[PDB]
A paper describes a structure:
Three potential binding sites (#1(370-387), #2(392-398), #3(409-414)) on the opposite side of the ULK1^MIT^ binding and one (#4(449-460)) on the same side of ULK1^MIT^ were identified ([Fig fig2]), consistent with previous hydrogen-deuterium exchange-mass spectrometry (HDX-MS) and site-directed mutagenesis data. The supercomplex structure showed that the N-terminus of the BECN1 and ATG14L binds near ATG13 sites #1-3 on FIP200. The interaction with site #2 is asymmetric and we therefore hypothesized that its main role is to inhibit 2:2:2 ULK1C formation. We hypothesized that PI3KC3-C1 acts by displacing the ATG13 from site #2, and potentially, sites #1 and 3. To test this model, we truncated ATG13^MR^ at residue 450 and determined the structure of the ATG13^1′1–450^ ULK1C core by cryo-EM in the absence of PI3KC3-C1. The 2D averages clearly show densities ULK1^MIT^-ATG13^MIM^ heterodimer on both sides of the shoulder ([Fig fig5]), which was confirmed by 3D reconstruction at 4.46 Å ([Fig figs2]). This demonstrated that ATG13^MR^ has an inhibitory function on recruitment of the second ULK1 kinase to the FIP200 dimer, which is relieved upon formation of the supercomplex with PI3KC3-C1.
Numbering used by the authors:
A (entry chain C), E (entry chain D): 840 to 1044
B (entry chain A): 1 to 81, 124 to 212, 304 to 387, 424 to 597
C (entry chain E), F (entry chain F): 462 to 476, 487 to 516
D (entry chain B): 160 to 209, 304 to 353, 461 to 595
Write the structure that this text describes.
């Protein structure tokens, strides 16, 4: 049953990392640049984000909703494993479940607040939203993973030479989670390609 | 036919499969793992005459798969770690060793050849990046003000209204969202952030030190080419003299010199062992320079790719700037198009009405004339030619006055003009 | 390998909204009920 | 026997009996035709020549093999063959004696009926030809009218084509200016749409040649011939 | 022994018959019962012909010239008969040739009539005579012969075949002359038709 | 016989003139000369 526990824990870590991605979506940080950043760029990005927060908040809501769906599936599976395979009611499993529940409550609160904020926004922008093809959450997750990998590689080159192993491991976990939640072979080929590439680059350690 | 080749790290001898002998040198790369050796991942080979073993290139195109002009192999894994018959038999070993010396010379020559290409390739990109980075260095200021103008334009677009009637193409909104609408994972803010991120990642504070390091590496490679190749400068003449002496002694043999020749044969091996000493000494300078050069090499190319891409998106970044005034003008253009469609419809209607009237009147006159004389007199044959119907003018209607154009309202234009930001002049 | 990987990763192997906006209240309420139920399940500890 | 077959020409005889006065009427029609032939001789024929001969002259010469005198003599001969004085009375007497092996009388009657029918058709041709001076005055009027209509239509169509060309050129210029301005900016093909449509210009073009096969009879010459032929100048 | 003269003599007899045909073209005639009821119709036709006598006289003179062709052919170096022995001890045949020469002189008088007609044609119907493309004299002679045959048939129906036999014989001689003049292929076919007609007439004898 | 003749009457067989018309005076002079020559010749009888 501890294998099922490990699968649950992997789901948990993927959820936590996805939540981190969501938070970064809520507000961007340029500290990952390393040495420095032009002040105007900070000012320009600030103005842009201030102007486009609503749609950014919308993307955040979509991401959080996908997170919530994952959490609900995990909770149903938790009820299932509680019915059978409790594995001595593992205190570790109990703590994992409790952390998951806290995250789920946070997700519910966040979704409610985001919906309340977007009420007028979703109201006014109804027509375009109808016109607009939805931004797939899995697409956003893949995009964050890819940008993270690219930045890590750029730091590996050009003599940053630090933190590469951490960001690499994190992105590997994120990619594995995306593959688990992929459920579409067409892009699953590209996902497997990226995962194999990450594993091969892991030989550097 | 299985291939027969050389391997300098393995005494200038090698064997391979028949596909390695005739097919693409990728078969030779696979057969490198064969014949009791490591694969091409831990080996490097070149054909006689310095021809580098291109895996895609057919071995037939290489024409070095047999003992005649055999290809030599450099093992990266190696870097990773009564009785008168002797008169010819002893000499037999020497000549092969003598040829091996010549074979050894080729490997260094081939090694030098790769360095030449390496030096050329590295130097070529160097200036290319040097120009590009300097171009970028000059461009650094240019890109900056452009981004600020882009931000001001984004603010104006926020102030700018939404598509109005164009929404129905398939409420309170702005073109900025409409602009932001397209390519949801790739918004404008994403573009600007990626651009500034590359710009910072393109720090001259790092680029210049990297450029200097690359130049120093290139100079070190040039020095190694000067040094390591010169490592065996005195070998050729000494080996030639020894081989000539061996030949003369063997010929004179037809046992005072027998041990002397045998010792000379033994004395040759020390030179061969001494030759091996120069090899690894030269070989270490080779790969260490080669690997480091490769590491730096793609980086600049990647940097160039990064340099190119930053240039690339810069245009697209530049592209969005005109969008406000462009759309402001486009609205007026569509309004003028509608007015022209109206005027053209009126003119076409008037013309069609007049043409129908005239065609009807002429048809009536022709009908009357026929009633008078259609087949009513033999005079029609002599007077033939008048029975023609009158001119066929354009009494029909036009096809379409550009129907595909989307809907719009002049009152909507006035409302936008009142509501719009300082771009009202672009739509004034 | 890792140095070479950058070329591969350099390329993006890439992968009506009002409909989703409609289901938002429904999914929200469903999540709220599931949250109450999950908190109850948590109480079992 | 053969009388049943001859009954076809026998029935024709009643038509001939009907034609007996009609031919006499046609004789009156023949006299009017002769007067009209004299009037056609007074009339000219030079217009649309393809010179200085008369209308009756050209008409008679319009067919070399035969002419008005030829058909007139043929009609007189047909009248003689169907003579009311004797032959038509003789034809009726033969029809009566048919009741008094009948191949000869039937064949003769059928041939005479065929000749008489041909005579009536030729008389119709003569009547059309006797109308032909009127039809010629009318055809000259129709040709002058066609010339006037062609002139007016040419003027109107040319003015229309020129105006349409000017309009199409102006619209094309404005559209080209607008297209050049931001030919590929702000995803104009995507943001906006359809602005690239060049305005239609079919109305700009001019018509082709029409009524070119006219015999090119001058209208002024037609008026001259009409004035020179006051006799039945009305048509 | 006398062909060079006898063939021309038959051609000249045909020419004399053609002159008679021209004379008939000069003024109308009535037969097959004589004048009919309202014979002024025939008088009407006479008035019309008088109004149009120019074309008839012109056709007659054109025929006169067509015959004068062969007349001059015989006249120019007329010793062919003597060379063939036709004139050998045949001064009477030479006198007949002189009669044919006086006939050619009459053809010259008819050609003077033709000259007057052509002057009147240039005066009126100049361009008409230019674009005349009219039937040659042979076609007109054949048409006159056919009209004679039709009159003969009408008379034979009218039981007046006494002189119609002579008319049939004269028309057969005219057909023979036309066959002697039957240069065209259609002329040969028409001569065959006339031979069949002559056979039918002989049957009617 | 008579019927065939009537049919022939009912359907008789069948077979720019300025080209011949203009040469009329020339042919007239030629014929006049030929006639004079034959007039001289006839005395040889």
């Amino acid at each position: 049953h501890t294998e099922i526990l490990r699968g649950l824990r992997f789901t948990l870590l993927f959820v936590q990392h996805v939540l981190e991605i969501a938070a970064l979506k809520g507000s961007a940080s340029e500290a990952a640049g390393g040495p420095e950043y032009q002040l105007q760029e900070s000012v320009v990005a600030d103005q842009i984000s201030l102007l486009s927060r609503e749609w950014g908040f919308a993307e955040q809501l979509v991401l959080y909703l996908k997170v919530a769906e994952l959490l609900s599936s995990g909770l149903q599976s938790a009820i299932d494993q509680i019915r059978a395979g409790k594995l001595c009611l593992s205190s570790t499993v109990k703590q994992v479940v409790r952390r998951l529940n806290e995250l789920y409550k946070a997700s519910v609160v966040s979704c409610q607040g985001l919906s309340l904020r977007l009420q007028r926004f979703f109201l006014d922008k109804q027509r375009l939203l109808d016109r607009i093809h939805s931004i797939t959450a899995e697409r956003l997750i893949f995009s964050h993973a890819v940008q993270m990998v690219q930045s890590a590689a750029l730091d590996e080159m050009f003599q940053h030479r630090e933190g590469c192993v951490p960001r690499y491991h994190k992105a590997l976990l994120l990619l594995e989670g995306l593959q688990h939640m992929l459920s579409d072979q067409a892009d699953i080929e590209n996902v497997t390609k990226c995962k194999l590439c990450i594993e091969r680059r892991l030989s550097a350690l | 036919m299985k291939l027969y080749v050389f391997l300098v790290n393995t005494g200038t001898t090698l064997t391979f499969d028949t596909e390695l002998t005739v097919q693409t040198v990728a078969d030779l790369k696979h057969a490198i793992q064969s014949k009791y050796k490591i694969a091409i991942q831990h080996q490097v080979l070149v054909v006689n005459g310095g021809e580098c073993m291109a895996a895609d290139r057919r071995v037939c195109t290489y024409s070095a798969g047999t003992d005649t002009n055999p290809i030599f192999l450099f093992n990266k894994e190696m870097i990773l770690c009564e009785m008168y018959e002797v008169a010819k038999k002893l000499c037999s070993f020497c000549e092969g060793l003598v040829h091996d010396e010549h074979l050894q010379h080729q490997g260094w020559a081939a090694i030098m050849a790769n360095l030449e290409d390496c030096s050329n390739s590295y130097q070529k990109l160097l200036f290319k990046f040097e120009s590009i980075y300097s171009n970028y260095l000059q461009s650094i200021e240019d890109i900056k003000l452009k981004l600020t103008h882009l931000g001001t334009a984004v603010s104006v677009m926020a102030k700018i209204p939404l598509l109005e009637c164009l929404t129905r193409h398939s409420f309170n909104v702005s073109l900025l969202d409409w602009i932001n609408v397209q390519d949801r994972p790739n918004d404008v803010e994403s573009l600007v952030r990626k651009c500034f991120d590359s710009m910072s990642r393109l720090d001259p504070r790092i680029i210049r030190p990297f450029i200097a390091e690359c130049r120093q590496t290139i100079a070190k490679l040039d020095n190694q080419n000067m040094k390591a190749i010169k490592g065996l400068e005195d070998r050729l003449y000494a080996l030639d003299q020894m081989i000539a002496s061996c030949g003369r002694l063997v010929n004179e043999q037809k046992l005072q010199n027998h041990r002397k020749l045998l010792d000379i044969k033994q004395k040759c091996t020390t030179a061969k062992q001494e030759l091996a000493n120069n090899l690894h000494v030269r070989l270490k300078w080779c790969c260490f320079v080669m690997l480091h050069a490769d590491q730096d090499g793609e980086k600049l190319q990647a940097l160039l790719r990064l340099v190119i891409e930053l240039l690339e998106r810069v245009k697209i970044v530049e592209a969005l700037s005109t969008v406000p005034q462009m759309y402001c003008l486009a609205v007026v253009e569509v309004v003028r198009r509608k007015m022209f469609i109206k005027h053209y419809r009126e003119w076409a209607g008037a013309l069609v009405k007049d043409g129908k009237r005239l065609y009807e009147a002429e048809k009536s006159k022709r009908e009357s004339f026929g009633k008078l004389f259609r087949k009513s007199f033999l005079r029609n044959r002599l007077f033939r030619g008048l029975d023609s119907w009158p001119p066929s003018f354009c009494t029909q209607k036009p096809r379409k006055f550009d129907c595909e154009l989307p809907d719009i309202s002049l009152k909507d234009l006035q409302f936008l003009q009142s509501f719009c930001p300082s771009e009202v002049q672009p739509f004034l | 390998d890792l140095g070479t990987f950058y070329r591969e990763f350099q390329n993006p192997p890439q992968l009506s909204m009002a409909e989703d906006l409609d289901s938002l209240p429904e999914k929200l309420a469903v999540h709220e009920k599931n949250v109450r139920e999950f908190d109850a399940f948590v109480e079992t500890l």
